[PDB]
């Protein structure tokens, strides 16, 4: 028992981190097989950042300008190319520590672990969700660009995020591993609207099931609701509308606890309308939306 | 910017995890150099657990009864001994992945990362604090025993905790790496009082400094207080009394923000007396005590 904001073990990803320097700029790169992936803004200077012409900036660079160091050892760069907002530096040596891996584009509301890195060295690991507005609320400082987000499926690392920038609001934006930004963001120092965000309803319900499994039951009530009624409440409180697809993915948790999904929706409805009255759920005084139904099952079963 | 409950990268510890089986019981072991450390209750059965005579149970075991598997490969056990509540199994091969390491006994209120494991395989990593009452509020299921807590100082892993048991209250108890329990706990299936716990005041103040650094400032007020006055409030709200030693370790954060420690104490006093009024601090609706002043500085500076 107990329920924590648990990240995947970061070892397989630590073995892929390298430092990439181009001119005066240094950030992190991800070395998988014989390619190093990093944010293309490694080729910019401060003057360039209002609206960089990445194509022109990259044309001024040669393979020898990209300095890649895997901890202590230097990698020899034999090719470079830009794909969307990432650079791919072909190196002459395949990373001996390359795990089995996939590049995936995650959906808003899904969760992943981030290995925050500086100068190619891992600093820490934390779990977070891709917000419905495609931002992440991470913990990143200057030099963290190129740090990645991922999930692990037994021996396979699915890389889903590469960190690119901090918005003026202090929230974070980045790309999938093909360099496509999540959300409307561009890699320019410009003020950029992140859409209206919402609370990930299916994750809050999954977390209420995790609470029941671990003995926090005070919020269970004698009520039920319908998807239509629940969605009027979700609307008022800026929660994502719940669909049958969300009810279906909560099926395992509903079966394990014997609490029908719509009955858990009625508990969530009352918590939204009444608040917590100074009480806590799994050590939190707010409704947590950073655990998916898969995360709750995985944590509550002991998946290695 | 941003502030997360960040754990240390778990790679150096993942390389030390093994599975230990004795008879019908399986748990995790920590393989450092040519020794595997694991909880001594690996030698018990269900009948034995009300009050095991560990000395007698161990006498019935030989080196060949301890099956140790490092992922896929079997280790040859050439010695066994019990030290307090841990067993030390001497193996004929030094772990090639042994990091630089130390065994340390942490103080109540200090934090560490846990790598939860099952059957010698890492499941996830999370950050937590050793409660003032020497329990930890972890996330552990049956089979997680032998999972360890640690901190990392550049290249050195300081192991501070090995998981042994779950109390009937759902909180966790374990030992340092010499097998001494933290707190009054014994490795028996008996109901056991965990002392009265308190909130780690110095950590809450460190976290209020982290909030100011990241822009959450609403709780700052026009007041100041004294250690004596602040401690009357801490007393009433079950917080640890603040000492000059705690004020001194908050010195760096006070210098960075320009907010005198006693002025931050007056903000904490008002939050204790008035609550949050439905507001949040660093995404939390309660006062967080799982970040030490060192953790806040480390996270806010980017230590790898
Ligand atoms: C368009 C663009 C891209 C990158 C940069 C640097 C940047 O944002 N680094 C950063 C990332 N995450 C957290 C804190 C910081 C400072 C500037 C402009
Ligand atoms: C004295 C003693 C020691 C160990 C055990 C098993 C045990 O507590 N395992 C466990 C640990 N952490 C979380 C959940 C579980 C079930 C029983 C009795």
Coordinates of C-alpha atoms and ligand atoms in Angstrom, one line a residue:
Chain A
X1 CA 0.0 0.0 0.0
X2 CA 0.8 3.7 -0.3
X3 CA 0.6 5.7 -3.5
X4 CA 3.3 7.9 -4.9
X5 CA 4.1 10.1 -7.9
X6 CA 6.4 7.4 -9.2
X7 CA 8.7 7.8 -12.2
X8 CA 10.1 4.9 -14.3
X9 CA 13.6 3.8 -13.4
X10 CA 15.9 6.2 -15.4
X11 CA 18.9 3.9 -16.0
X12 CA 18.2 3.0 -19.6
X13 CA 17.8 6.7 -20.5
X14 CA 20.9 7.9 -18.4
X15 CA 23.0 5.7 -20.7
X16 CA 21.8 7.7 -23.7
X17 CA 22.5 11.2 -22.5
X18 CA 25.3 13.2 -24.1
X19 CA 26.3 16.9 -24.2
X20 CA 26.1 18.8 -27.5
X21 CA 27.9 22.1 -28.0
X22 CA 27.7 24.3 -31.0
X23 CA 29.7 27.5 -30.8
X24 CA 28.9 29.0 -27.4
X25 CA 25.7 27.0 -26.8
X26 CA 25.6 23.7 -24.9
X27 CA 22.6 21.5 -24.3
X28 CA 21.7 17.8 -24.0
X29 CA 21.5 15.2 -26.7
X30 CA 20.0 11.7 -26.8
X31 CA 22.4 9.1 -28.4
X32 CA 20.6 6.0 -29.7
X33 CA 22.4 3.7 -32.1
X34 CA 24.7 6.0 -34.3
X35 CA 22.5 9.2 -34.1
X36 CA 22.4 12.0 -31.5
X37 CA 19.1 13.9 -31.3
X38 CA 19.1 17.4 -29.8
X39 CA 17.0 20.6 -30.1
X40 CA 17.9 22.6 -33.2
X41 CA 18.2 25.8 -31.1
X42 CA 21.7 24.5 -30.1
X43 CA 22.8 26.4 -33.3
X44 CA 21.5 29.8 -32.1
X45 CA 23.1 32.8 -30.3
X46 CA 21.2 35.4 -28.1
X47 CA 20.7 37.8 -31.1
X48 CA 19.3 35.0 -33.3
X49 CA 16.5 34.1 -30.8
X50 CA 13.7 36.6 -31.6
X51 CA 13.1 34.7 -34.9
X52 CA 16.0 32.5 -35.9
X53 CA 16.3 31.4 -39.5
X54 CA 17.3 27.8 -38.7
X55 CA 17.9 26.9 -42.3
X56 CA 20.5 29.7 -42.7
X57 CA 22.0 29.2 -39.3
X58 CA 22.5 25.4 -40.0
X59 CA 24.1 26.1 -43.4
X60 CA 26.9 28.0 -41.6
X61 CA 27.7 24.8 -39.6
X62 CA 29.8 21.7 -40.4
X63 CA 29.9 18.3 -38.8
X64 CA 33.1 19.4 -36.9
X65 CA 31.2 22.3 -35.3
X66 CA 29.0 19.9 -33.3
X67 CA 30.9 18.8 -30.3
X68 CA 29.4 15.7 -28.7
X69 CA 30.7 14.3 -25.5
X70 CA 29.4 11.1 -23.9
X71 CA 30.4 11.8 -20.4
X72 CA 34.2 11.9 -20.9
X73 CA 34.6 10.6 -24.5
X74 CA 34.2 12.6 -27.6
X75 CA 32.0 11.4 -30.5
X76 CA 33.0 11.9 -34.1
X77 CA 30.2 13.5 -36.1
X78 CA 29.9 12.3 -39.7
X79 CA 26.6 13.8 -40.7
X80 CA 24.0 16.4 -39.6
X81 CA 20.4 17.1 -40.6
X82 CA 17.5 19.0 -39.3
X83 CA 14.1 17.3 -39.0
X84 CA 11.4 19.7 -37.9
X85 CA 12.8 21.3 -34.6
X86 CA 15.4 18.6 -33.9
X87 CA 18.9 18.0 -35.2
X88 CA 20.1 14.5 -35.9
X89 CA 23.9 14.2 -35.7
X90 CA 25.2 11.0 -37.2
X91 CA 28.1 9.7 -35.3
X92 CA 30.7 7.0 -36.2
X93 CA 29.9 4.9 -33.1
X94 CA 26.7 3.2 -32.1
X95 CA 25.9 3.8 -28.4
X96 CA 26.8 0.6 -26.7
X97 CA 24.2 1.4 -24.0
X98 CA 21.3 1.8 -26.5
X99 CA 18.2 0.2 -25.0
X100 CA 15.3 -1.3 -27.1
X101 CA 13.4 1.9 -27.9
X102 CA 10.6 3.5 -29.9
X103 CA 9.7 7.1 -30.7
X104 CA 6.1 7.8 -29.9
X105 CA 3.9 10.9 -29.9
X106 CA 1.8 10.9 -26.7
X107 CA -1.7 12.1 -26.3
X108 CA -2.7 15.0 -24.1
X109 CA -3.6 13.6 -20.7
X110 CA -1.0 10.8 -20.9
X111 CA 1.9 10.7 -18.4
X112 CA 5.7 10.2 -18.7
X113 CA 8.9 10.4 -16.7
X114 CA 11.4 13.2 -17.4
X115 CA 15.1 12.8 -16.8
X116 CA 16.3 16.4 -16.2
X117 CA 19.9 16.8 -17.5
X118 CA 22.5 19.6 -17.6
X119 CA 25.7 19.3 -19.7
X120 CA 24.8 15.7 -20.6
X121 CA 24.6 14.7 -17.0
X122 CA 21.4 13.5 -15.3
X123 CA 20.2 15.6 -12.4
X124 CA 16.9 14.0 -11.4
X125 CA 13.8 12.2 -12.5
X126 CA 10.1 13.1 -12.0
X127 CA 6.8 12.0 -13.3
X128 CA 4.4 14.4 -15.1
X129 CA 1.4 14.6 -17.5
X130 CA 1.2 16.2 -20.9
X131 CA -1.4 18.9 -20.2
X132 CA -4.6 19.0 -22.4
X133 CA -3.1 22.3 -23.7
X134 CA 0.1 20.5 -24.7
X135 CA 2.4 22.1 -22.1
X136 CA 4.1 20.3 -19.3
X137 CA 4.6 21.7 -15.8
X138 CA 8.2 20.5 -15.4
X139 CA 11.2 21.6 -13.4
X140 CA 13.8 22.8 -15.9
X141 CA 16.5 25.5 -15.8
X142 CA 18.7 27.0 -18.6
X143 CA 20.8 24.1 -20.0
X144 CA 18.1 21.5 -19.5
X145 CA 17.1 21.6 -23.2
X146 CA 17.4 18.2 -24.9
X147 CA 16.3 16.4 -21.6
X148 CA 13.7 13.8 -22.6
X149 CA 10.4 12.3 -21.4
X150 CA 9.7 8.6 -21.8
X151 CA 7.7 5.5 -20.7
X152 CA 9.1 2.0 -20.3
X153 CA 7.3 -1.2 -21.4
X154 CA 9.4 -4.0 -19.7
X155 CA 12.6 -3.6 -21.7
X156 CA 11.4 -1.0 -24.3
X157 CA 11.9 2.7 -23.8
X158 CA 9.3 4.8 -25.7
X159 CA 10.7 8.3 -26.0
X160 CA 7.8 10.8 -26.2
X161 CA 9.2 14.2 -25.3
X162 CA 12.3 16.4 -25.8
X163 CA 12.5 19.6 -23.8
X164 CA 12.8 22.8 -25.9
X165 CA 11.7 25.9 -24.0
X166 CA 10.2 27.7 -21.1
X167 CA 7.2 29.9 -21.9
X168 CA 7.1 33.4 -20.2
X169 CA 4.5 31.8 -17.9
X170 CA 7.0 29.4 -16.5
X171 CA 5.5 26.3 -18.1
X172 CA 7.3 24.1 -20.5
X173 CA 7.1 23.2 -24.2
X174 CA 8.8 20.6 -26.3
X175 CA 8.6 18.1 -29.2
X176 CA 8.2 14.4 -30.0
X177 CA 11.5 12.8 -31.1
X178 CA 10.8 13.7 -34.8
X179 CA 11.0 17.4 -33.7
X180 CA 7.3 18.2 -34.0
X181 CA 6.2 20.5 -31.1
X182 CA 3.3 19.4 -28.9
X183 CA 0.8 22.3 -29.2
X184 CA 1.0 25.5 -31.1
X185 CA 4.5 26.4 -30.0
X186 CA 7.5 27.5 -32.1
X187 CA 11.2 27.6 -31.1
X188 CA 11.4 31.5 -31.0
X189 CA 11.7 33.9 -28.0
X190 CA 8.2 35.3 -28.5
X191 CA 5.3 35.4 -26.0
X192 CA 3.1 32.5 -27.0
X193 CA -0.5 31.6 -26.0
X194 CA -0.8 28.1 -24.4
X195 CA -4.5 27.2 -24.8
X196 CA -7.0 27.1 -22.0
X197 CA -6.1 24.1 -20.0
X198 CA -8.5 21.6 -18.3
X199 CA -8.2 19.0 -15.6
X200 CA -7.8 15.4 -16.9
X201 CA -11.0 13.9 -15.6
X202 CA -10.2 10.3 -16.4
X203 CA -7.0 10.6 -14.4
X204 CA -8.7 12.2 -11.4
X205 CA -11.1 9.2 -11.4
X206 CA -8.2 6.8 -11.7
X207 CA -6.6 8.5 -8.7
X208 CA -9.9 8.3 -6.7
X209 CA -9.8 4.5 -7.4
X210 CA -6.2 4.4 -6.2
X211 CA -7.3 6.2 -3.0
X212 CA -10.0 3.6 -2.4
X213 CA -7.5 0.7 -3.0
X214 CA -5.2 2.3 -0.4
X215 CA -7.9 2.9 2.2
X216 CA -8.8 6.6 1.7
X217 CA -12.6 6.2 1.3
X218 CA -14.2 9.2 3.1
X219 CA -15.3 10.8 -0.3
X220 CA -17.4 7.7 -1.3
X221 CA -21.1 8.6 -1.1
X222 CA -24.6 7.2 -1.5
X223 CA -25.0 8.8 -5.0
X224 CA -24.8 8.0 -8.6
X225 CA -24.9 10.2 -11.7
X226 CA -25.0 9.9 -15.5
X227 CA -22.4 10.9 -18.1
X228 CA -24.6 13.8 -19.1
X229 CA -25.1 15.1 -15.6
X230 CA -21.5 14.5 -14.7
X231 CA -20.4 16.5 -17.9
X232 CA -22.5 19.5 -16.9
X233 CA -20.4 19.6 -13.6
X234 CA -17.2 18.9 -15.5
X235 CA -18.0 21.8 -17.8
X236 CA -18.6 24.2 -14.9
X237 CA -15.3 23.2 -13.2
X238 CA -13.1 23.2 -16.3
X239 CA -12.7 19.4 -16.4
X240 CA -12.4 17.4 -19.6
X241 CA -15.8 15.9 -20.7
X242 CA -15.9 12.2 -19.8
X243 CA -16.6 9.8 -22.7
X244 CA -17.5 6.1 -22.9
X245 CA -13.9 5.5 -24.0
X246 CA -12.7 7.0 -20.6
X247 CA -15.4 4.9 -18.7
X248 CA -14.1 1.8 -20.6
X249 CA -10.4 2.4 -19.7
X250 CA -11.5 2.7 -16.0
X251 CA -13.1 -0.8 -16.3
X252 CA -10.2 -2.6 -14.6
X253 CA -10.3 -0.3 -11.6
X254 CA -14.1 -0.4 -11.4
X255 CA -13.8 -4.3 -11.4
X256 CA -11.1 -4.4 -8.8
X257 CA -12.9 -2.1 -6.3
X258 CA -16.5 -3.0 -7.2
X259 CA -17.3 0.7 -7.5
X260 CA -19.2 1.5 -10.7
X261 CA -17.6 4.3 -12.8
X262 CA -20.7 6.5 -12.6
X263 CA -20.8 6.0 -8.8
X264 CA -17.2 7.2 -8.7
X265 CA -18.3 10.1 -11.0
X266 CA -20.9 11.0 -8.3
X267 CA -18.1 11.1 -5.7
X268 CA -16.0 13.4 -8.0
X269 CA -19.1 15.6 -8.6
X270 CA -19.6 16.1 -4.8
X271 CA -15.9 16.9 -4.3
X272 CA -16.0 19.5 -7.1
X273 CA -19.2 21.1 -5.7
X274 CA -18.2 20.9 -2.0
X275 CA -14.4 20.9 -2.0
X276 CA -12.4 18.7 0.5
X277 CA -13.6 20.5 3.7
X278 CA -10.0 20.6 4.9
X279 CA -9.5 16.8 4.3
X280 CA -6.9 15.0 2.2
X281 CA -6.9 12.1 -0.4
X282 CA -3.6 10.2 -0.7
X283 CA -1.8 13.1 1.1
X284 CA -3.2 15.7 -1.3
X285 CA -5.5 18.6 -0.6
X286 CA -6.5 18.9 -4.3
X287 CA -7.8 16.6 -7.0
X288 CA -4.8 15.0 -8.6
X289 CA -4.8 14.4 -12.4
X290 CA -1.3 13.2 -13.1
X291 CA -2.0 9.5 -12.8
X292 CA -3.6 7.6 -15.7
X293 CA -5.7 4.5 -15.2
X294 CA -2.7 2.5 -16.5
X295 CA -0.4 4.1 -14.0
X296 CA -2.8 3.3 -11.1
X297 CA -3.0 -0.4 -12.2
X298 CA 0.8 -0.6 -12.7
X299 CA 1.6 0.9 -9.3
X300 CA -1.1 -1.1 -7.5
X301 CA 0.1 -4.4 -9.1
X302 CA 3.9 -4.0 -9.1
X303 CA 5.0 -4.0 -12.8
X304 CA 8.8 -4.2 -13.3
Chain B
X1 CA 11.6 27.4 -13.3
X2 CA 9.0 24.9 -11.9
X3 CA 9.4 22.7 -8.8
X4 CA 8.8 19.0 -8.7
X5 CA 9.2 16.1 -6.3
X6 CA 12.3 15.0 -8.0
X7 CA 14.2 11.8 -7.3
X8 CA 17.9 11.1 -8.0
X9 CA 18.6 9.2 -11.3
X10 CA 18.2 5.6 -10.4
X11 CA 20.7 4.0 -12.9
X12 CA 23.6 3.4 -10.4
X13 CA 21.2 1.6 -8.1
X14 CA 19.4 -0.4 -10.8
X15 CA 22.8 -2.0 -11.6
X16 CA 22.9 -3.3 -8.0
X17 CA 19.5 -5.0 -7.7
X18 CA 19.3 -8.8 -7.5
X19 CA 16.6 -11.3 -6.5
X20 CA 17.2 -13.4 -3.4
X21 CA 15.1 -16.5 -2.8
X22 CA 15.3 -18.7 0.3
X23 CA 12.9 -21.6 0.3
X24 CA 9.5 -20.3 -0.8
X25 CA 10.3 -16.6 0.0
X26 CA 11.6 -14.2 -2.7
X27 CA 12.7 -10.5 -2.2
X28 CA 15.3 -8.0 -3.4
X29 CA 18.9 -7.9 -2.6
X30 CA 21.6 -5.1 -3.1
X31 CA 24.8 -6.4 -4.7
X32 CA 27.8 -4.2 -4.0
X33 CA 31.3 -5.5 -4.6
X34 CA 31.1 -9.3 -3.6
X35 CA 28.3 -9.0 -1.0
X36 CA 24.5 -9.1 -1.4
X37 CA 22.5 -7.4 1.3
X38 CA 18.9 -8.3 1.9
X39 CA 16.3 -8.3 4.7
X40 CA 16.8 -11.3 7.0
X41 CA 13.0 -12.1 6.9
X42 CA 13.8 -13.8 3.5
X43 CA 14.5 -16.9 5.7
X44 CA 10.9 -16.9 7.3
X45 CA 7.7 -18.7 6.4
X46 CA 4.1 -17.5 7.2
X47 CA 4.0 -19.6 10.5
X48 CA 7.4 -18.1 11.6
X49 CA 6.3 -14.5 11.3
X50 CA 4.4 -13.8 14.7
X51 CA 7.9 -13.9 16.5
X52 CA 10.6 -15.5 14.3
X53 CA 13.7 -16.8 16.0
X54 CA 16.1 -15.6 13.3
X55 CA 19.2 -17.2 14.8
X56 CA 17.5 -20.6 14.8
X57 CA 16.0 -20.1 11.3
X58 CA 19.4 -19.1 9.9
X59 CA 21.1 -22.1 11.4
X60 CA 18.9 -24.4 9.3
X61 CA 20.2 -22.6 6.1
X62 CA 23.4 -23.2 4.1
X63 CA 25.0 -21.0 1.4
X64 CA 23.3 -23.2 -1.3
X65 CA 19.9 -22.4 0.1
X66 CA 20.2 -18.7 -0.9
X67 CA 19.4 -18.4 -4.5
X68 CA 20.7 -15.1 -5.9
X69 CA 20.0 -14.1 -9.5
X70 CA 21.3 -10.8 -11.1
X71 CA 18.7 -10.4 -13.7
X72 CA 19.4 -13.6 -15.7
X73 CA 22.6 -14.9 -14.1
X74 CA 23.0 -16.9 -11.0
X75 CA 25.5 -15.8 -8.3
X76 CA 27.5 -18.4 -6.3
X77 CA 27.1 -17.8 -2.6
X78 CA 30.2 -18.6 -0.6
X79 CA 29.3 -17.1 2.8
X80 CA 26.3 -15.9 4.8
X81 CA 25.9 -13.9 8.0
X82 CA 23.3 -11.9 9.8
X83 CA 24.1 -8.4 11.0
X84 CA 21.2 -6.9 13.0
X85 CA 18.1 -7.3 10.6
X86 CA 20.0 -7.8 7.3
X87 CA 21.7 -10.8 5.8
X88 CA 25.0 -10.4 4.0
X89 CA 25.6 -13.1 1.4
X90 CA 29.2 -13.3 0.2
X91 CA 29.3 -14.1 -3.5
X92 CA 32.3 -15.3 -5.6
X93 CA 31.9 -12.4 -8.1
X94 CA 32.2 -8.6 -7.4
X95 CA 29.3 -6.7 -9.1
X96 CA 30.9 -5.1 -12.2
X97 CA 28.3 -2.3 -12.0
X98 CA 29.2 -1.4 -8.3
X99 CA 29.1 2.4 -8.1
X100 CA 31.2 4.4 -5.6
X101 CA 29.0 4.1 -2.5
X102 CA 28.7 4.7 1.2
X103 CA 26.3 3.3 3.9
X104 CA 24.8 6.2 5.9
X105 CA 22.2 6.4 8.6
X106 CA 20.0 9.4 7.8
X107 CA 18.4 11.7 10.2
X108 CA 14.6 12.1 10.6
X109 CA 13.4 14.9 8.4
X110 CA 16.1 14.1 5.7
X111 CA 14.9 13.0 2.2
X112 CA 16.0 10.2 -0.2
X113 CA 14.9 8.4 -3.4
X114 CA 13.5 4.9 -3.3
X115 CA 13.9 2.5 -6.2
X116 CA 10.9 0.2 -5.7
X117 CA 11.7 -3.3 -6.9
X118 CA 10.0 -6.7 -7.3
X119 CA 11.9 -10.0 -8.0
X120 CA 15.1 -8.0 -8.4
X121 CA 13.7 -5.8 -11.1
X122 CA 13.2 -2.1 -10.7
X123 CA 9.6 -0.9 -11.0
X124 CA 9.8 2.8 -10.2
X125 CA 11.5 5.6 -8.4
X126 CA 10.1 8.2 -6.0
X127 CA 11.3 10.8 -3.6
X128 CA 10.3 10.8 0.1
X129 CA 11.3 11.9 3.6
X130 CA 12.2 9.9 6.7
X131 CA 9.3 11.0 9.0
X132 CA 10.3 12.5 12.4
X133 CA 8.7 9.3 13.8
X134 CA 11.1 7.1 11.6
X135 CA 8.5 5.7 9.3
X136 CA 8.3 6.4 5.6
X137 CA 5.1 6.9 3.6
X138 CA 6.2 4.9 0.6
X139 CA 4.5 2.9 -2.2
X140 CA 5.4 -0.7 -1.6
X141 CA 3.6 -4.0 -2.2
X142 CA 4.4 -7.6 -1.1
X143 CA 7.8 -8.6 -2.7
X144 CA 9.2 -5.0 -2.5
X145 CA 11.3 -5.9 0.6
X146 CA 15.0 -5.3 0.0
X147 CA 14.2 -2.2 -2.2
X148 CA 16.5 0.7 -1.1
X149 CA 16.6 4.4 -0.4
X150 CA 19.6 6.5 -1.3
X151 CA 21.1 9.9 -2.2
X152 CA 23.7 10.7 -4.8
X153 CA 26.6 13.1 -4.3
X154 CA 28.0 13.5 -7.9
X155 CA 29.4 9.9 -8.5
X156 CA 28.8 8.5 -4.9
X157 CA 25.6 6.6 -3.9
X158 CA 24.9 6.9 -0.2
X159 CA 22.6 4.1 0.7
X160 CA 20.4 5.0 3.6
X161 CA 17.4 2.7 3.7
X162 CA 16.4 -0.9 3.0
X163 CA 12.7 -1.7 3.0
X164 CA 11.5 -4.3 5.5
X165 CA 7.8 -4.0 6.3
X166 CA 4.5 -2.4 6.2
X167 CA 2.8 -1.5 9.4
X168 CA -0.9 -2.3 9.9
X169 CA -1.5 1.5 9.4
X170 CA -0.1 1.2 5.8
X171 CA 3.1 3.1 6.5
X172 CA 6.6 1.7 6.0
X173 CA 9.5 0.7 8.1
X174 CA 13.0 -0.4 7.4
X175 CA 16.7 -0.3 8.3
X176 CA 20.0 1.4 7.5
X177 CA 22.4 -0.9 5.4
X178 CA 23.9 -2.3 8.7
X179 CA 20.4 -3.7 9.4
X180 CA 19.4 -1.4 12.3
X181 CA 15.8 -0.3 12.1
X182 CA 14.9 3.3 12.0
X183 CA 12.6 3.8 14.9
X184 CA 11.3 1.3 17.5
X185 CA 10.3 -1.3 14.9
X186 CA 11.1 -5.0 14.9
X187 CA 10.8 -7.5 12.1
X188 CA 7.8 -9.4 13.5
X189 CA 4.1 -9.5 12.4
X190 CA 2.9 -7.6 15.5
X191 CA 0.9 -4.3 15.8
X192 CA 3.6 -1.7 16.5
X193 CA 3.2 1.9 17.6
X194 CA 4.9 4.5 15.3
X195 CA 5.4 7.5 17.5
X196 CA 3.5 10.8 17.2
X197 CA 4.6 12.3 13.9
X198 CA 5.2 16.0 13.3
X199 CA 5.6 18.2 10.2
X200 CA 9.2 19.0 9.3
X201 CA 9.2 22.7 9.8
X202 CA 12.6 23.4 8.2
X203 CA 11.5 21.6 5.1
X204 CA 8.2 23.6 4.9
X205 CA 10.2 26.8 5.1
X206 CA 12.7 25.6 2.4
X207 CA 9.6 24.8 0.2
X208 CA 8.2 28.3 0.8
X209 CA 11.5 29.7 -0.4
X210 CA 11.3 27.4 -3.5
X211 CA 7.8 28.8 -4.1
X212 CA 9.1 32.5 -3.9
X213 CA 12.0 31.6 -6.3
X214 CA 9.4 30.1 -8.8
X215 CA 7.0 33.1 -8.5
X216 CA 4.4 31.9 -6.0
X217 CA 4.5 34.8 -3.7
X218 CA 0.9 35.4 -2.5
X219 CA 1.6 34.1 1.0
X220 CA 4.4 36.7 1.7
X221 CA 3.1 39.2 4.3
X222 CA 4.1 42.4 6.1
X223 CA 4.9 40.5 9.3
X224 CA 7.8 39.1 11.2
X225 CA 8.0 36.8 14.2
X226 CA 10.6 35.5 16.7
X227 CA 11.8 31.8 17.2
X228 CA 9.9 31.8 20.5
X229 CA 6.6 33.1 19.1
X230 CA 6.9 30.9 16.0
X231 CA 7.5 27.8 18.2
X232 CA 4.3 28.5 20.2
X233 CA 2.5 28.3 16.8
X234 CA 4.6 25.2 15.7
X235 CA 3.6 23.5 19.0
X236 CA -0.1 24.1 18.4
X237 CA 0.0 22.8 14.9
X238 CA 2.2 19.8 15.5
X239 CA 5.2 21.1 13.7
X240 CA 8.8 20.5 14.8
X241 CA 10.3 23.3 16.9
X242 CA 12.6 25.5 14.8
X243 CA 16.1 25.9 16.1
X244 CA 19.0 28.3 15.2
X245 CA 20.6 25.2 13.5
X246 CA 17.5 25.1 11.1
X247 CA 17.7 28.9 10.6
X248 CA 21.4 28.5 9.7
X249 CA 20.7 25.8 7.1
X250 CA 18.1 28.1 5.5
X251 CA 20.8 30.9 5.2
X252 CA 21.5 30.2 1.5
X253 CA 17.8 30.5 0.6
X254 CA 17.3 33.6 2.7
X255 CA 20.4 35.1 0.9
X256 CA 19.1 34.2 -2.5
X257 CA 15.7 35.6 -2.0
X258 CA 16.4 38.5 0.4
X259 CA 13.7 37.2 2.7
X260 CA 14.8 36.9 6.3
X261 CA 14.2 33.5 7.9
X262 CA 12.0 35.0 10.6
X263 CA 9.9 36.9 8.0
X264 CA 9.4 33.6 6.2
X265 CA 8.4 32.1 9.6
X266 CA 5.7 34.9 9.9
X267 CA 4.4 33.8 6.5
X268 CA 4.3 30.2 7.7
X269 CA 2.6 31.3 11.0
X270 CA -0.2 33.0 9.0
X271 CA -0.7 30.0 6.7
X272 CA -0.9 27.7 9.8
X273 CA -3.4 30.0 11.5
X274 CA -5.5 30.9 8.3
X275 CA -5.0 28.0 5.9
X276 CA -4.7 28.5 2.2
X277 CA -8.2 29.9 1.6
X278 CA -8.5 27.7 -1.4
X279 CA -5.2 28.8 -3.0
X280 CA -2.2 26.7 -4.0
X281 CA 1.6 26.9 -3.5
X282 CA 3.7 25.1 -6.2
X283 CA 0.6 23.2 -7.2
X284 CA -0.1 22.0 -3.7
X285 CA -3.1 22.8 -1.5
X286 CA -1.2 21.8 1.7
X287 CA 2.2 22.7 3.3
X288 CA 4.8 20.4 1.8
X289 CA 7.6 19.1 4.1
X290 CA 9.4 16.6 1.8
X291 CA 12.0 19.0 0.4
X292 CA 15.0 19.9 2.6
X293 CA 16.9 23.2 2.2
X294 CA 19.6 21.2 0.3
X295 CA 17.0 19.8 -2.1
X296 CA 15.6 23.2 -2.9
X297 CA 19.1 24.6 -3.6
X298 CA 20.1 21.6 -5.7
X299 CA 16.8 21.7 -7.7
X300 CA 17.0 25.5 -8.1
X301 CA 20.7 25.4 -9.3
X302 CA 20.8 22.3 -11.5
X303 CA 23.2 19.9 -9.7
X304 CA 24.1 16.7 -11.9
Ligands
LIG1 C1 12.9 29.7 -28.2 C2 14.0 29.5 -27.2 C3 14.4 28.2 -26.9 C4 15.3 28.0 -25.8 C5 15.8 29.0 -25.1 C6 16.4 28.8 -23.7 C7 15.3 28.2 -22.8 O1 14.1 28.5 -23.0 N1 15.8 27.5 -21.8 C8 15.0 27.1 -20.7 C9 14.3 25.9 -20.8 N2 13.6 25.4 -19.8 C10 13.7 26.1 -18.6 C11 14.4 27.2 -18.4 C12 15.1 27.8 -19.5 C13 15.8 29.1 -19.4 C14 15.4 30.3 -25.4 C15 14.5 30.5 -26.5
LIG2 C1 7.6 -8.5 10.0 C2 7.3 -8.8 8.5 C3 8.1 -8.4 7.5 C4 7.8 -8.5 6.2 C5 6.5 -9.1 5.9 C6 6.0 -8.9 4.5 C7 5.7 -7.4 4.3 O1 5.4 -6.7 5.3 N1 5.7 -7.0 3.0 C8 5.3 -5.8 2.6 C9 6.1 -4.7 2.6 N2 5.8 -3.5 2.2 C10 4.6 -3.3 1.6 C11 3.6 -4.3 1.6 C12 4.0 -5.6 2.1 C13 2.9 -6.7 2.2 C14 5.7 -9.5 6.9 C15 6.1 -9.4 8.2

